[PDB]
Each structure stands twice: as structure tokens, then as C-alpha cells.
Amino acid sequence: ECESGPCCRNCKFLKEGTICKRARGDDMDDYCNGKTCDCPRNPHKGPAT
Amino acid sequence: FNLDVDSPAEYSGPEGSYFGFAVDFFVPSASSRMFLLVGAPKANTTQPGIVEGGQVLKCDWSSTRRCQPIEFDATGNRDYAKDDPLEFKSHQWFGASVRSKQDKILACAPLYHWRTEMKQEREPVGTCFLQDGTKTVEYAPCRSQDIDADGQGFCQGGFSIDFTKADRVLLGGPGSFYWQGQLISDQVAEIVSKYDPNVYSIKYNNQLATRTAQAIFDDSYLGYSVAVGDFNGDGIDDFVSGVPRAARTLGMVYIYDGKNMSSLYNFTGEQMAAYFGFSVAATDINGDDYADVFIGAPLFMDRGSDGKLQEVGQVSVSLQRASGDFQTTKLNGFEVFARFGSAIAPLGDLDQDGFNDIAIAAPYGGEDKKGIVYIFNGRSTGLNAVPSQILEGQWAARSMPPSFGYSMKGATDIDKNGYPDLIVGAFGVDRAILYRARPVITVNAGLEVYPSILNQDNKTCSLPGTALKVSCFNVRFCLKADGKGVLPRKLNFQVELLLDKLKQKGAIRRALFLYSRSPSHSKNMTISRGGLMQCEELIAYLRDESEFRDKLTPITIFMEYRLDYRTAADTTGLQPILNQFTPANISRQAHILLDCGEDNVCKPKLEVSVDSDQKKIYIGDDNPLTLIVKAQNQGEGAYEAELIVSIPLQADFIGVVRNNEALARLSCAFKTENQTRQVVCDLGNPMKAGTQLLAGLRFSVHQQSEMDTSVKFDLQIQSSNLFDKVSPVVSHKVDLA
Amino acid sequence: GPNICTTRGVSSCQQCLAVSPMCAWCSDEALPLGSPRCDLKENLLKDNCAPESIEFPVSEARVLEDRPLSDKQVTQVSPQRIALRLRPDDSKNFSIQVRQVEDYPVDIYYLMDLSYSMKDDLWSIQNLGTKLATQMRKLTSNLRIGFGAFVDKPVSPYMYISPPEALENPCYDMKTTCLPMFGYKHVLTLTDQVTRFNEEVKKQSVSRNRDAPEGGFDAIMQATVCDEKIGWRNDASHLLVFTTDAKTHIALDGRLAGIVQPNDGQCHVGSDNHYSASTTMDYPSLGLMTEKLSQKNINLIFAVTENVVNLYQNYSELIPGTTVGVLSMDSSNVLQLIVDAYGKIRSKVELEVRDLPEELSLSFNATCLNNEVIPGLKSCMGLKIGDTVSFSIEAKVRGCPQEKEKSFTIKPVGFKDSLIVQVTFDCDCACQAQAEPNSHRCNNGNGTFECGVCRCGPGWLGSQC
Numbered sequence A: 001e002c003e004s005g006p007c008c009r010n011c012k013f014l015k016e017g018t019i020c021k022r023a024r025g026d027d028m029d030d031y032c033n034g035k036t037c038d039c040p041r042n043p044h045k046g047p048a049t
Numbered sequence B: 001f002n003l004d005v006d007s008p009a010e011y012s013g014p015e016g017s018y019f020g021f022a023v024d025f026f027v028p029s030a031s032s033r034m035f036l037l038v039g040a041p042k043a044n045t046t047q048p049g050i051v052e053g054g055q056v057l058k059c060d061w062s063s064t065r066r067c068q069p070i071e072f073d074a075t076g077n078r079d080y081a082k083d084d085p086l087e088f089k090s091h092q093w094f095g096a097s098v099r100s101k102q103d104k105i106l107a108c109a110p111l112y113h114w115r116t117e118m119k120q121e122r123e124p125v126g127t128c129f130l131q132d133g134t135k136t137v138e139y140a141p142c143r144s145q146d147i148d149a150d151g152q153g154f155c156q157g158g159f160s161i162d163f164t165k166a167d168r169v170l171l172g173g174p175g176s177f178y179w180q181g182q183l184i185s186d187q188v189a190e191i192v193s194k195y196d197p198n199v200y201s202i203k204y205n206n207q208l209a210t211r212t213a214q215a216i217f218d219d220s221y222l223g224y225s226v227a228v229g230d231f232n233g234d235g236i237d238d239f240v241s242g243v244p245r246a247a248r249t250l251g252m253v254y255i256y257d258g259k260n261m262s263s264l265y266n267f268t269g270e271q272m273a274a275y276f277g278f279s280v281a282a283t284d285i286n287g288d289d290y291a292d293v294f295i296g297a298p299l300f301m302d303r304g305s306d307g308k309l310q311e312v313g314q315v316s317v318s319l320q321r322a323s324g325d326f327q328t329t330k331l332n333g334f335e336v337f338a339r340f341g342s343a344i345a346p347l348g349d350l351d352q353d354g355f356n357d358i359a360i361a362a363p364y365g366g367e368d369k370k371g372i373v374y375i376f377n378g379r380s381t382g383l384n385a386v387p388s389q390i391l392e393g394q395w396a397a398r399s400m401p402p403s404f405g406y407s408m409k410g411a412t413d414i415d416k417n418g419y420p421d422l423i424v425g426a427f428g429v430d431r432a433i434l435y436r437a438r439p440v441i442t443v444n445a446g447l448e449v450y451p452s453i454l455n456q457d458n459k460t461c462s463l464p465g466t467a468l469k470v471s472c473f474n475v476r477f478c479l480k481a482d483g484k485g486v487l488p489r490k491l492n493f494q495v496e497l498l499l500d501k502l503k504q505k506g507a508i509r510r511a512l513f514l515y516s517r518s519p520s521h522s523k524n525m526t527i528s529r530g531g532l533m534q535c536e537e538l539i540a541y542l543r544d545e546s547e548f549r550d551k552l553t554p555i556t557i558f559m560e561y562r563l564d565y566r567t568a569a570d571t572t573g574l575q576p577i578l579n580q581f582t583p584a585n586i587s588r589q590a591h592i593l594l595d596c597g598e599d600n601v602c603k604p605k606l607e608v609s610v611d612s613d614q615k616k617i618y619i620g621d622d623n624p625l626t627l628i629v630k631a632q633n634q635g636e637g638a639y640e641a642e643l644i645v646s647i648p649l650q651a652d653f654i655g656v657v658r659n660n661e662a663l664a665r666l667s668c669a670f671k672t673e674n675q676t677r678q679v680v681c682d683l684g685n686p687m688k689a690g691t692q693l694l695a696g697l698r699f700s701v702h703q704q705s706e707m708d709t710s711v712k713f714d715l716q717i718q719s720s721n722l723f724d725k726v727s728p729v730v731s732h733k734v735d736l737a
Numbered sequence C: 001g002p003n004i005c006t007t008r009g010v011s012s013c014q015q016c017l018a019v020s021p022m023c024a025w026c027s028d029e030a031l032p033l034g035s036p037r038c039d040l041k042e043n044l045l046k047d048n049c050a051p052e053s054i055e056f057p058v059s060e061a062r063v064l065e066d067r068p069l070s071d072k073q074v075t076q077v078s079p080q081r082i083a084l085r086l087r088p089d090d091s092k093n094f095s096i097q098v099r100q101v102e103d104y105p106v107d108i109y110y111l112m113d114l115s116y117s118m119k120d121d122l123w124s125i126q127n128l129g130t131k132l133a134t135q136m137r138k139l140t141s142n143l144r145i146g147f148g149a150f151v152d153k154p155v156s157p158y159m160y161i162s163p164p165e166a167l168e169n170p171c172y173d174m175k176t177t178c179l180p181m182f183g184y185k186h187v188l189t190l191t192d193q194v195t196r197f198n199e200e201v202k203k204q205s206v207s208r209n210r211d212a213p214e215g216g217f218d219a220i221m222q223a224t225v226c227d228e229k230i231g232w233r234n235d236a237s238h239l240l241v242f243t244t245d246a247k248t249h250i251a252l253d254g255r256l257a258g259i260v261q262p263n264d265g266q267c268h269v270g271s272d273n274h275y276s277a278s279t280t281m282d283y284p285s286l287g288l289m290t291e292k293l294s295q296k297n298i299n300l301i302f303a304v305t306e307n308v309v310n311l312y313q314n315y316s317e318l319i320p321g322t323t324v325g326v327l328s329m330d331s332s333n334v335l336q337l338i339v340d341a342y343g344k345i346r347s348k349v350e351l352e353v354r355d356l357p358e359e360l361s362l363s364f365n366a367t368c369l370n371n372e373v374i375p376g377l378k379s380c381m382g383l384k385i386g387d388t389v390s391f392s393i394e395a396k397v398r399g400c401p402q403e404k405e406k407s408f409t410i411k412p413v414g415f416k417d418s419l420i421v422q423v424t425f426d427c428d429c430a431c432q433a434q435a436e437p438n439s440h441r442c443n444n445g446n447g448t449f450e451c452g453v454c455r456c457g458p459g460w461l462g463s464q465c
């Protein structure tokens, strides 16, 4: 399987800095590290909400 | 080109109320009275606890020109609870967009903030107040339950609105779905029938609405400007919306189906941040029954003379075809920092020529940055790229630019004379101006002249006072007028006839009228519209054949006509205009019969010769010197023939030899003009073919410088003819002894 | 034979010297009466005049100190002091040089986007500020640096106007503390205190608005036009580093918020260091931005993140003279842009003359980098650091004044160093210092005898009274 990750397009991890969830409005884009297939939350975005 | 500018009608609103921000006409179906609808988005209303809540006024046209507000909404902020306002009408900008069908008025408030039904918020959903003469309803299409920034919370519905001919409302909110934009189409009947004041989120049927898209389309501002026109097979009007920030801020225009809101075509700008889609229009400009898209980019920058970009603005004209093809052309601006394509207002057939016209306004152009409105007339090929009229603002800025031309309306005849009018709204001074088109009178002038060749010998004419029996010819002139719309039956015309045109440089006049005995003759004509020719016969007689300077230049007939301009309408003195592209003067040519071969031009051959008969003169004495000159023209007629003897600084002329019959008595003169003294002698006018002249000229020579060794003359014959008018220069030398 | 000296200067020393630079005088009594007293020096020797009796002072340029122009105090005009000697109606030529060795003066202003989209790029923006200050201090010594901030126009729908507790803290909905929103906040005027700049830059924090486009063009325009507030120096090279990570609001975008007044062009920053007309005036258009930048001689530089590099490169193509960098963990791109901007810094040398007397006149021959002597020009453009230029100057004097001493200064504009002269008009013979008062030697007459010749008073028109 390849899990169809938001940053794990196909099965190989994408390059660090790729945007998995484009920020809407004056917000911070969600980036992917390149070692986890999920779309991790931006660290300094809020109260970890 | 016929819009009246000397006496327009101005409407003034409350100071600082942005009066005239959005203008429109009123065309009630149940009454014959025509009103002007003008928006005042920052005016003060009597609503309780509402400051600068905006208002929409209706201003009469022939009744004291007074403006009275329309009571769309006389209530204040509704309360959701004990102390919990539900809506916020303060600074709501009501009246920022005014549209009007026959009996319906749609005035929208883009910035109306409404507290949601779920949480205490302030969201500029925007509301629209539809009025059907008696029943005034509130139409807020995007005040729904999906309230957030992600949805229609910041819809600002009513930013741009339009009416389709099938009784449908086109509404544009540039803020819906994170400023992606939205178009909402609801039937007027459904809006009126579904109104219920106790419920705020009303769901209408037959609603066409654009849906949310991906996050890459955010901040596109779809619905910033909406137009309505038909762009496919069916007769249902399609929706044209401006998307000025789309395609990485290039600009775009979206055309959606008018039956199920499906995208059909797309326009895209060429320059970033040019704001391509600020104002759009859909009118048929070439008159083949196919609507054409006009897209404004007021911030367009184009290269100038030195290659530096200048912000002039641009308007793109896209001509529809039988297929989906569009023949797009560009109409560049005229002044830097003027925002040319700011407002586009289709005037309809302004001059009633067959093809609709259009007006594009630069609100920050002209002198003192007041405002300029251009008028371009549509043609069969397309849109004329040269404006045929310039409208200037006449109110200086107080604290904000006047913005004359920020919003106009057209294609509505308000004085019932058959020509569409134009309201121009300058909100920087809180003014609204109504320009009424003048009737266009076309004139088919005619000037029939007798045969161009005039025979001087043919003198079978009579004269008053002396009866000199000289040649004469007749000139016939007449004109017709016919224009559409209201126009008086009899139009006063005055025609001036000028004889020997293109020669009024202080010279003499050769052709002269028989009776008036003047080169100029003016007559007054009272002609009828759509009538036949009304031609008067005038007789002109030429002067003596040996009186005028030359008989080479053709005699020109000039007839200039001017409308009386006192045939004005009884309403406000609206004087009719003459057609712009037709000439106001007719010129015909006449020639003086002169035997000049088959090519109709006289081409002479001029020869000159001279002998010495002395061959030597002595230095110390004043020696009588006679030169025998032979001047012959073996070609055709030479007009104004004279021989030029350019004597040197030494000798001077004495006289012609008359003691012998072998030589002639030529009339001779001493000339000194233009740095050179010379002797001229008349050779005959004209100088007939094969004529051989022989005469002698007496002189007196006294040497200047003691080492000169020769006396050199120069002989040359010249004529006023156009080709072969000069003889070869012959130089005769006399040796000093 | 006869010459100008023999017809004009035959009176005495002062007028003989005043006639022509080459005129010479003889103060020998052995010369018989009739022979010219003012003539050529060679001619004077031919007439057998005593060389000790020949008064032929030649105009000369006597340099006093000639330390060479320094290279990379510093010396920038050589010579710096000339003793100049002119007889009346004479010209003398000397050569000066201007070598721009002093560092270019530079002004850098830093525009920081402090929106909530920049909470991740805050460290990058502060690191770029510190690296910029360090790099420009390394490149040039005369450096002034400051900074500012911008979020967007504080009006709805950009702002958070509800709940009322979110007017003082827009991140209430996110349950975090962020500073109230502002249009443009000028923080630090242009100062040479890099430590203060670093402190105030590190003391910054983000704000929050609603939509992704920011009001950075308003901040650019205000930083451009508020000359006195920012602190732009008249004779300096201005650089404006603009930072952002999202799209930019363009003109006519304020109609949504209800602003329909075009950007007038003036400066609206008040005594509170805030853009006062943020809520009443629209965003500035690219044409106006271009016009103001060219008028104020400001080099805009876009230091934007990776995701808007192409967008702002196209904007820069629409704004001539603008370069775009990339904002990242390292500031190498924008630092190279700054270094290149310093590299295309071109200096000009406009020679100026102060307290120039009426009598003296000067002629300039500018020998610029093309080595082509151009008469009538005195200002060579295009000079760089370590670049050397020269000027040929010939001083002409009309007659001689009674001052007997004057000094004037030659100086390149914008240069600390200068050349100063000490013009001492001869205007007389040395032997007139030993002149005889009246009569006595000059026979029984009562005129005056000096330098071997006598010139009587009124009435006595004779050679020797």
C-alpha cells in the first residue's frame, strides 16, 4: 500500500516544504516534513487546536 | 457626437453623501412620468440609530429637478434578543448599486453587516431591497445558514447587480468563499412571493448560484462587475461577470449559461495588476444581432514614446461571431493616470444610425483631474477607435477627486425625442448630470455645375447696366435633410457660394455672378425633412479674356451650408446636430477652354537666341549696345510668356528699338526684385504656337573693375505653364576692348 | 622690432608687466634713451641690457604639499595646496586630481510583514534584518539603517471587528494573543546604531487580519514618500528591502471595504508613527509606485518567500529597476542582491569653486575614464572606488588688484578634502621696493625715479623732466 498521503503522493515521500493544505486567508500553510505521509499541523499556528 | 453639453441638468445631494455613486433611470409601466434613480451610499437617513446608512433618491426630470428618497426601509437595526442587535445598517453603503426595470427597483447595500443566527458576529453579507411600485421586499440571497468566511459570510451581495429580460435578477458577491466570488440568479416573482419579514434566511427556488472552488481561486473577486447578454443559441440571457484578480491578478471575465449557470467562454488579460474586469458590458456594437463583450482594465500600463510604461488603462472589445469565436481588439487609454476603462456604459443607438454606441469614461483625466467621458460609435466592421465626443467635468475637487464618469447609465430616452440619453455620476462633489442626445440631421448636398470647359469666345449672354455681352455659365446647388426622431418639419438653411476658391490670397477674381455682381452670394433656404431636391439656378459671368492674371488654374465652386441651429426642441432648447462624418462643404471644378491638344494640357517648346552685332565695346565710354533677341515658341500655347534678360551689374536698359519694322515694339520693364536686376518684356498671353518674335534692346555699359575682360548676359523665356514652362538659358558674351 | 610691449608697456614696470606675460623690463641706466624699455627678454639681451636689470617674473605654479591620493585621514584631491603666482593679464595652468576612495553612503530601510501568515517567517525576517545590517556595514562604512511594519488596512472585511474583545486582540477566535492590527507602523528612523536596529527588530511580533493579500504597497509608498520621517539622506544611495509571504492588495481592491479615494501621493505618517489615511485612501497602483520610486531615487528590493517568487518577479518586470530575492533560512539571495546594488553604485565628481574673485578666470579640461580631454566640462560621471580622474585647470587674471594676496578653495562636491590656492599677484617690479621718492636723482626735475627710469608729474612731459 501507499496510503495516499496528502504529501505522500504515489508512495515515495515528497520533498520537504511541499504544501499539503493551502492556507485560506491570512493564515499559515501546512507543510510536510518528508518523513511522515500525513499532513502535519504547523507548529506555531495556535494553541495546538 | 450629439450629446448636449452646453446645458446639461445637474442634481446635487447631501454634502459628503457620495450622491451619484450609482445612477439609473426609472421607466414606470403604469405611469408616463420618467425619473432618475441615483444612489447616495453615505447619506444620512431617518432610521432610528442609523448614521450614514445610505439612501436611494429618485430625481424628476421636468419637475423642479428635485430629489426625493425612496423609503425602501424605514426601520432601524432589528434585535435578535433583549440587548442583541441582529443587523447593523450603519455605514452599510445602501445605494451603491441601483438597477431598475420597468416597475422594479433593485437597490443593494454591499456593506450591510448582519449578526449570524449562531454566534455574535458582524459579517457584510449585503442586502438588496426590491421594490415593485407598491410592495417593497428585502432580497438577501446570501444571508443563509452556511455563514462563515469559508461560505457566504462576507458575500457583500449586491456589489454588482443586473436585470435580465426574462424577469431574473443577476447578483454578484465578490467576497463569497474566501473572496472567490459568487453569482446568484433568482427570479423576481420568486423573490417577491417568498418574502416573509419574520424569517431572515429565505430559500428561493429556481436559484442559479456559482459554487465554491479550490483554494487556488481565492481572492479572485468574481462578481466584481456583472453584465447580462445572450451568447449562445437560445434567447435566454447569459451572465457575464468580471473577475479582476483572477489568473495571478491578470484579470478574467467569466460567461455563464443563463439557464443553468454553466461556464461558456473566458477572457484573460495580458498584464498583471491591470484590473481586467473592473467594468464589463454586453451590447451589440456592429448590429448583426449578437451581443459583444467589453472589458475594462483601468490600470493597464503600456510602453510610451521612450519605452517606459505609462498607466493609461485599456478596454477590450470582443465581437461575437456565428460560432464561439470572438474578434478581440484593444482600445488604449489617452492620458496617464486617468483609469480609462473605469466605467463602460452602452448608450444604445445614440445617433440612430443602425449600430449601437458606447461610452467609456476616465474619471481622473482631463485638466485638474476632474474627469473625461469618451464616446465611441459602433460601425459595421466593429467599434470606432477614435472617440467622437469629449465630456469634461466642471466641478473642482473639494476633499476627494470628483470622479466624473465613475458610473454612467444609457439607452433610455427620457425626453421622448427618439434618442437615448446618459446620466453621469460624479460622487466626489456629490453631483449627478443628465446629458440628452441631440437629433442628428444628415444632409445630402448637391452642386451641379454647367460643363466645366468655358469658352471665352462664346459670349451669348446679357448683362445688366451695360450689356457688355460676355461669357456666362450657370451653377445649380441644392440639398436635402432627413433625420430620425423628433425634428421640426422645416429646417432653416443658409448657403454661401464662393467663386474661385483656393485662390483667396489677395489675387484677382475671374468668375463673377451675373446679378449679385459679387464673388460671394448667400441665400436662405427653408427645406423640409425627407423632401426632394430644392434647387435654385444661379448665373455667373466670367471677366474679360485679357483681364485676369492667368487662365491656367481651374475655377473652383465652393458651397458651404450651416444649419440655423434655432430649430431647437420646445423642452429645453435642444438644437439638432448635423451628421459628424458628412462634409459641410461641396467643391466643384471648372476649366477655361484652351486648345491644348488631346492631353488637355498645353506643353510649349520655348527657344531663345541672340547675336552681338558689335562683338566688342571699349572700356572708357558709355557704349550703346543693342541685342537682337529671337523668342519663338514652337510648342503649344505659353501662358503669360515673357523673356528674362538678367543683365549684369554693369549695364542698364535704355529702350526697345522702334525705328525699324523688322523688329517689334515689345512692352518692356526694368525689374530689381530679389537680389537681381533684370529686364522683362511681354511676349503675349497666351504665346501662340509657332509664333516667332524678333526685337532689339538698347543698353549702356560702363565697366566696374578695370580687369573684367567680358560682359556676359543671360536670356531665358519662362511661362506660368505646368510642364515645359521655361526655355533653355542662353548666355551672350560681349568682349571689352 | 616693435611689439605690444614697445607700444603699451613703455611707461614703467607696473604697466609693462600688465601688458603681456612675455613683456620684460630693463632697469639699467646704461641703456641709451630711445631704446625700448619694455620688450622681449631675448630682445632685451640683444639690446645689451644687464641681466640683473632685467625684471622678467614668470608665472609659475608652486605646489607646497604633494602627498599622494590614498588607496584602499584619506586624501582625495592632489595637490591640496598650490602657491600660484600671476603677473597681470597672464594665464597659468596646473593639474589636479580627484580619486574617489571614500566609501559610498548607503540607506537601507526594512519593511516587515507582520501578519499572521508571517508567524513562521518571523525568524527569517529578523535574521535577514541582522544579516543585512552586518553585510552592509562590512561593504560600506557610511551606513544608515532602519525598519518598519505593515499588516493591512484596519477596516472590515480585512479586520476583526467582532467580538469587541477581538478589536484589541484579533486572535481571540484562535484563543491566542496577537497584537492589534495596523496599516503601517514606522518603528525606527534611519540611524547608524546597528545594535538598536537589531534590538528593535528582534522585539517584533505578528498581528492578524482576514484575507491573504496584505497592504504592503501602502507601506512601500509611505516609506518612499515620507522622506523626513524615514530619514532618507539627500546624497545617499537608498535601498528598500520589502518582505512578504502572501499576495499583495493592488489598487481598486479597497472598493470592497468602501474606500474609493485614489492614493493621492503625499506622506500621511503623523507624530504617532502611524499611517493615518489607511482607512480613507485606496492602495497605490504600480504606475504611481514606479513614479514615486524614480522621483525619490529608491531601489526597491523584494525579499519574498518561495511561493510568491514568480508572482513578485512578474511584478518587478512591471516595475523597472527592481530586483526580487528569495526569503529563506539563509539570506544569501537578498544579500547578493544588496551587494550587487552596492556594486552598481556610481559616483560623480562635480568640481566647485568658492570665494572666487572677479579678476581670476578658470578653464576646465575634464579627463575622464575615456582619457579624452573634453574642454568646457568639469564633472566626470561614472567614478568608482579606487578610480582616479584628473582635471586641467588654467587660471587667467585680468590686470592686477591692490590686494596683493588672495586665496580661493577648489573642492569636489560631496568630498571632505579640498585644494586651496594662495594667489599673489606680482603686479610690480622687485626694484620698485627700492624706489626713490621724488626729484634728486631725476635731474633738476621733481618727478619720480624708480627702477632706472624716471616718470615726471603733471606738466613735465619730458623723459627725464
Ligand SMILES: *[C@@H]1O[C@H](CO)[C@@H](O[C@@H]2O[C@H](CO)[C@@H](O[C@@H]3O[C@H](CO[C@@H]4O[C@H](CO)[C@@H](O[C@H]5O[C@H](CO)[C@@H](O)[C@H](O)[C@@H]5O)[C@H](O)[C@@H]4O)[C@@H](O)[C@H](O[C@H]4O[C@H](CO)[C@@H](O)[C@H](O)[C@@H]4O)[C@@H]3O)[C@H](O)[C@H]2NC(C)=O)[C@H](O)[C@H]1NC(C)=O
Pocket (backbone or CB within 6 Å): B212, B213, B214, B217, B254, B263, B264, B265, B266
Ligand atoms: C473559464 O475559467 C474558469 C476558471 O479557470 C474555469 O472554471 C474552472 O473549471 C475547471 C474545469 O475546467 C474546474 O476544475 C474542476 O473543479 C471541480 C471542483 O470540484 C472539487 O471537488 C472536490 C471534492 O469536494 C474538491 O477538490 C478535490 O480535488 C482537487 C483537485 O481538483 C484536490 O486538490 C482537492 O484536495 C480535492 O481532493 C473541491 O471541493 C472542488 O470543489 C473538480 O471536481 C473537477 O474535477 C474534474 O476534472 C479532473 C481533471 O482536472 C478529473 O480528474 C475529475 O475526475 C473531474 O472530472 C475539476 O477539477 C474549476 O473548479 C473551475 N473553477 C471555477 C472558479 O470556475 C472554467 O471552466 C473556464 N471555462 C472554459 C469554457 O474554459
Ligand SMILES: *[C@@H]1O[C@H](CO)[C@@H](O[C@@H]2O[C@H](CO)[C@@H](O[C@@H]3O[C@H](CO)[C@@H](O)[C@H](O)[C@@H]3O)[C@H](O)[C@H]2NC(C)=O)[C@H](O)[C@H]1NC(C)=O
Pocket (backbone or CB within 6 Å): B014, B015, B016, B017, B042, B043, B044, B051, B052
Ligand atoms: C451623518 O450624520 C452623522 C451624525 O453623527 C455625521 O457623523 C458626525 O460627523 C461629524 C462631522 O461632521 C463628526 O464630528 C467629528 O468629531 C470628531 C471627534 O469625535 C472630530 O475629531 C472631527 O473633527 C469632527 O468634528 C461626528 O463625530 C460624527 N458622528 C459620529 C461619528 O457619530 C455624518 O458626518 C453625517 N454624514 C453626512 C454625509 O452628512
Ligand SMILES: *[C@@H]1O[C@H](CO)[C@@H](O[C@@H]2O[C@H](CO)[C@@H](O[C@@H]3O[C@H](CO)[C@@H](O)[C@H](O)[C@@H]3O)[C@H](O)[C@H]2NC(C)=O)[C@H](O)[C@H]1NC(C)=O
Pocket (backbone or CB within 6 Å): B450, B451, B455, B458, B459, B460, B461, B472, B473, B474
Ligand atoms: C455659350 O454660353 C451659353 C451660356 O449663356 C450656353 O447656353 C447654355 O448652355 C448649356 C450647356 O452649356 C445648356 O443648358 C441646357 O439647358 C437645357 C434646358 O434648356 C437642359 O435640358 C440641358 O440639360 C442643359 O442644362 C443650354 O444650351 C444653355 N442654357 C442656358 C440656361 O442658357 C451655350 O450653350 C454656350 N455655347 C457654347 C457653344 O459653348
Ligand SMILES: *[C@@H]1O[C@H](CO)[C@@H](O[C@@H]2O[C@H](CO)[C@@H](O)[C@H](O)[C@H]2NC(C)=O)[C@H](O)[C@H]1NC(C)=O
Pocket (backbone or CB within 6 Å): B257, B259, B260, B261, B262
Ligand atoms: C447546463 O446546460 C448546458 C447547456 O445548456 C449543458 O451542456 C450540454 O449538455 C449536454 C448533455 O450533457 C451535451 O450533449 C451538450 O453537448 C452540452 N453542451 C455544451 C457542453 O455546450 C449542461 O450539461 C447543463 N448541466 C450542467 C452544466 O451541469
Ligand SMILES: *[C@@H]1O[C@H](CO)[C@@H](O[C@@H]2O[C@H](CO)[C@@H](O)[C@H](O)[C@H]2NC(C)=O)[C@H](O)[C@H]1NC(C)=O
Pocket (backbone or CB within 6 Å): B583, B584, B585
Ligand atoms: C471644408 O470641409 C473640410 C472637410 O470636409 C473641412 O476642412 C478640413 O478638412 C480636413 C480633411 O477633411 C479635416 O481633417 C479637418 O478637420 C477640416 N477642418 C475642420 C475645421 O474641421 C472643413 O469642414 C471645410 N474647410 C474649409 C476651408 O472650408
Ligand SMILES: *[C@@H]1O[C@H](CO)[C@@H](O[C@@H]2O[C@H](CO)[C@@H](O)[C@H](O)[C@H]2NC(C)=O)[C@H](O)[C@H]1NC(C)=O
Pocket (backbone or CB within 6 Å): B247, B248, C310, C311, C314
Ligand atoms: C509570471 O510570468 C510567467 C511568464 O512571464 C508565467 O509563466 C507562464 O504561465 C502561464 C500560465 O498559464 C503559462 O501558460 C506560460 O507558458 C508560462 N510561461 C513561462 C515562460 O513560464 C508565470 O505563471 C507568472 N507567475 C504568476 C504567479 O502568474
Ligand SMILES: *[C@@H]1O[C@H](CO)[C@@H](O[C@@H]2O[C@H](CO)[C@@H](O)[C@H](O)[C@H]2NC(C)=O)[C@H](O)[C@H]1NC(C)=O
Pocket (backbone or CB within 6 Å): C093, C363, C364, C365, C373, C375, C392, C393, C394
Ligand atoms: C584643454 O585642451 C585644449 C585642447 O587639447 C587646449 O588647447 C590647446 O592649448 C595649447 C596651449 O595653449 C595650444 O598650444 C593648442 O594649440 C590648443 N589646442 C586647441 C585645439 O585649442 C587647452 O589649452 C586645454 N586647457 C586647459 C586648461 O588645459
Ligand SMILES: *[C@@H]1O[C@H](CO)[C@@H](O)[C@H](O)[C@H]1NC(C)=O
Pocket (backbone or CB within 6 Å): B494, B522, B523, B524
Ligand atoms: C438670410 O438670413 C440671415 C439670418 O437669418 C439674414 O441675416 C440675411 O439677411 C438673410 N439673407 C437673405 C438674402 O434673406
Ligand SMILES: *[C@@H]1O[C@H](CO)[C@@H](O)[C@H](O)[C@H]1NC(C)=O
Pocket (backbone or CB within 6 Å): C061, C093, C094, C095
Ligand atoms: C600647461 O600646458 C602646456 C601645454 O601648452 C604643458 O606643456 C604644461 O605642462 C602645462 N602645465 C603643467 C603644470 O603641466
Ligand SMILES: [Ca+2]
Pocket (backbone or CB within 6 Å): B230, B231, B232, B233, B234, B235, B236, B237, B238, B257, B258, B259
Ligand atoms: Ca443563453
Ligand SMILES: [Ca+2]
Pocket (backbone or CB within 6 Å): B284, B285, B286, B287, B288, B289, B290, B291, B292, B319, B320
Ligand atoms: Ca455583434
Ligand SMILES: [Ca+2]
Pocket (backbone or CB within 6 Å): B349, B350, B351, B352, B353, B354, B355, B356, B357, B377, B378
Ligand atoms: Ca451610432
Ligand SMILES: [Ca+2]
Pocket (backbone or CB within 6 Å): B412, B413, B414, B415, B416, B417, B418, B419, B420, B421, B436, B437
Ligand atoms: Ca433623449
Ligand SMILES: [Ca+2]
Pocket (backbone or CB within 6 Å): B596, B597, B598, B599, B600, B601, B602, B603, B636
Ligand atoms: Ca498638349
Ligand SMILES: [Ca+2]
Pocket (backbone or CB within 6 Å): A027, A028, A029, C117, C118, C119, C120, C121, C245
Ligand atoms: Ca507563512
Ligand SMILES: [Ca+2]
Pocket (backbone or CB within 6 Å): A026, C151, C152, C153, C158, C209, C210, C211, C212, C213, C214, C215
Ligand atoms: Ca489583509
